[PDB]
Design an enzyme around this catalytic site. Structure first.
Site, short mmCIF file in Angstrom:
data_model
loop_
_atom_site.label_atom_id
_atom_site.label_comp_id
_atom_site.label_asym_id
_atom_site.label_seq_id
_atom_site.Cartn_x
_atom_site.Cartn_y
_atom_site.Cartn_z
N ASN A 1 -27.88 92.26 36.90
CA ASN A 1 -27.23 92.20 35.60
C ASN A 1 -25.70 92.33 35.73
O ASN A 1 -24.99 92.67 34.79
CB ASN A 1 -27.88 93.13 34.56
CG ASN A 1 -27.87 94.58 34.85
OD1 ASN A 1 -27.03 95.09 35.63
ND2 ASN A 1 -28.80 95.27 34.19
N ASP B 1 -26.73 93.56 29.99
CA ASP B 1 -27.90 94.38 29.64
C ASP B 1 -27.51 95.80 29.26
O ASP B 1 -27.42 96.70 30.10
CB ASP B 1 -28.98 94.32 30.74
CG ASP B 1 -29.85 93.08 30.66
OD1 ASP B 1 -29.76 92.36 29.65
OD2 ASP B 1 -30.62 92.84 31.62
N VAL C 1 -34.53 84.99 29.35
CA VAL C 1 -33.26 84.37 29.04
C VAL C 1 -33.42 82.86 29.13
O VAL C 1 -33.88 82.34 30.14
CB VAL C 1 -32.08 84.97 29.87
CG1 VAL C 1 -30.73 84.42 29.41
CG2 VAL C 1 -32.09 86.49 29.76
N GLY D 1 -35.59 89.72 32.45
CA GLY D 1 -34.77 90.91 32.60
C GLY D 1 -34.26 91.41 31.26
O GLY D 1 -34.20 90.64 30.31
N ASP E 1 -28.37 101.19 33.91
CA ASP E 1 -29.12 100.19 34.68
C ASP E 1 -28.19 99.18 35.40
O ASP E 1 -28.43 97.96 35.34
CB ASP E 1 -30.23 99.52 33.81
CG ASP E 1 -31.33 98.80 34.56
OD1 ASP E 1 -31.51 99.07 35.77
OD2 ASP E 1 -32.02 97.95 33.94
N1 LIG Z 1 -31.26 89.74 34.88
C1 LIG Z 1 -31.44 88.73 33.81
C2 LIG Z 1 -31.04 87.36 34.33
C3 LIG Z 1 -31.51 86.26 33.38
C4 LIG Z 1 -30.98 84.87 33.76
N2 LIG Z 1 -29.52 84.87 33.92
C5 LIG Z 1 -28.89 83.58 34.05
C6 LIG Z 1 -29.28 82.71 35.05
C7 LIG Z 1 -28.57 81.51 35.26
N3 LIG Z 1 -29.01 80.65 36.24
C8 LIG Z 1 -28.35 79.51 36.40
C9 LIG Z 1 -27.23 79.14 35.65
C10 LIG Z 1 -26.79 79.98 34.67
C11 LIG Z 1 -27.46 81.20 34.44
C12 LIG Z 1 -27.11 82.11 33.41
C13 LIG Z 1 -27.81 83.27 33.20
N4 LIG Z 1 -27.50 84.13 32.11
C14 LIG Z 1 -26.44 84.07 31.22
O1 LIG Z 1 -25.68 83.11 31.12
C15 LIG Z 1 -26.27 85.26 30.34
C16 LIG Z 1 -25.21 85.55 29.47
N5 LIG Z 1 -25.28 86.83 28.93
N6 LIG Z 1 -26.46 87.32 29.44
C17 LIG Z 1 -27.04 88.53 29.23
C18 LIG Z 1 -28.25 88.83 29.82
C19 LIG Z 1 -28.83 87.85 30.61
N7 LIG Z 1 -28.29 86.63 30.84
C20 LIG Z 1 -27.10 86.39 30.27
C21 LIG Z 1 -29.07 85.86 34.90
C22 LIG Z 1 -29.53 87.27 34.53
#
Ligand SMILES: NCC1CCN(c2cc3ncccc3cc2NC(=O)c2cnn3cccnc23)CC1
Length: 286
Positions: free
Chosen positions: A148, A161, A39, A34, A143
């Site tokens: 997000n 995002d 990520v 994403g 978006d």
């Molecule tokens: N739509 C894209 C997705 C990409 C993945 N992301 C995450 C999934 C997770 N699964 C389990 C435990 C912790 C998690 C933290 C995430 N992400 C973050 O911690 C995070 C922090 N800022 N950020 C910005 C964009 C995407 N992810 C993050 C969720 C959004």
């Protein structure tokens, strides 16, 4: 840890186990795709982080530079925090969100229990506080979707995002971006307005009530926004659409949030409420 740090690509490559594309559950570092990147889960100063490895070549660099810009200017309690970046080896480093996204949690991904109506109410309030901050600072997200809207250690809504975010009267573009299923009609037609963000938030609200994804090619209706038409043309009630994975979902409060969603999903962009009214209506709800 009070400043935006410039990271070495080899530091990020190292704390993400060579950007281990395998998911977390199998012992890898991939958290999901994403925002025109993948990520990964990282570990910097005995502290956990989220590393976005970006993947045209000039269009991507633009989205990297946009993210750094927006994330420095827009710092709020309902917005994700930028820790740092790297261009030496393109990675954006964020403060880790232990509960992932609203989308993953509404799907109960990887054994998580369903979110209660009470937490769902606070998430919607938080996300509306976040959009209100952006809007109050002449920023259009472009978006807004459940994938997000991120969740912290207390399940606080943290909007992410910003790569496509616009900093500003309704204007038009040649490059149309966003997710179809959440996009207002005028935004699909090339207009750039914060009014389109309101409409997108309205779809997020219906996802929260129903637990259903915005689009499903085989489901009837296919587009979650069309359930407003089924409710209006009295073939169904919002009651029928309430997520079955809830214990505490009361009818008075569900109908109050759906009244908010309905206003947000007005097809006439001027008839929609502004984010201040969306906030006031959601606070009145609790
Ligand atoms: N739509 C894209 C997705 C990409 C993945 N992301 C995450 C999934 C997770 N699964 C389990 C435990 C912790 C998690 C933290 C995430 N992400 C973050 O911690 C995070 C922090 N800022 N950020 C910005 C964009 C995407 N992810 C993050 C969720 C959004």
């Amino acid at each position: 840890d009070t400043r935006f740090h410039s990271f070495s690509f080899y530091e990020l490559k190292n704390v993400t186990n060579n950007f281990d594309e395998r998911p977390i559950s199998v012992g890898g570092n991939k958290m999901g795709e994403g925002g025109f990147g993948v990520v990964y889960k990282g570990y910097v100063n005995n502290t956990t982080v989220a590393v976005k490895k970006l993947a045209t070549t000039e269009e991507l660099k633009q989205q990297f530079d946009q993210e750094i810009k927006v994330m420095a200017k827009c710092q709020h309690e309902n917005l994700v925090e930028l820790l740092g970046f790297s261009s030496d080896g393109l990675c954006l480093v964020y403060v880790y969100m232990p509960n992932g996204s609203l989308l993953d949690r509404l799907s109960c991904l990887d054994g998580t229990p369903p979110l209660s109506w009470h937490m769902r109410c606070k998430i919607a309030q938080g996300a509306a506080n976040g959009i209100n901050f952006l809007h109050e600072n002449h920023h259009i997200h472009r978006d807004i979707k459940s994938a997000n809207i991120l969740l912290d250690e207390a399940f606080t809504a943290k909007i992410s995002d910003f790569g496509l975010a616009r900093a500003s009267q309704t204007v038009m573009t040649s490059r149309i971006v966003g997710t179809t299923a959440y996009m207002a009609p005028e935004a699909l037609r090339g207009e750039i307005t914060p009014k389109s963000d309101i409409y997108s938030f309205g779809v997020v609200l219906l996802e929260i009530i129903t637990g259903l994804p915005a689009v499903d090619e085989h489901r009837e209706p296919q587009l979650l926004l069309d359930i407003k038409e089924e409710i209006e043309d009295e073939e169904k009630t919002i009651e029928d659409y309430i997520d079955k994975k809830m214990n505490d979902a009361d009818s008075t409060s569900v109908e109050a949030m759906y009244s908010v969603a309905s206003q947000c999903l007005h097809e006439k962009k001027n008839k929609r409420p502004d984010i201040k009214k969306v906030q006031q209506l959601l606070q009145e709800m609790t």
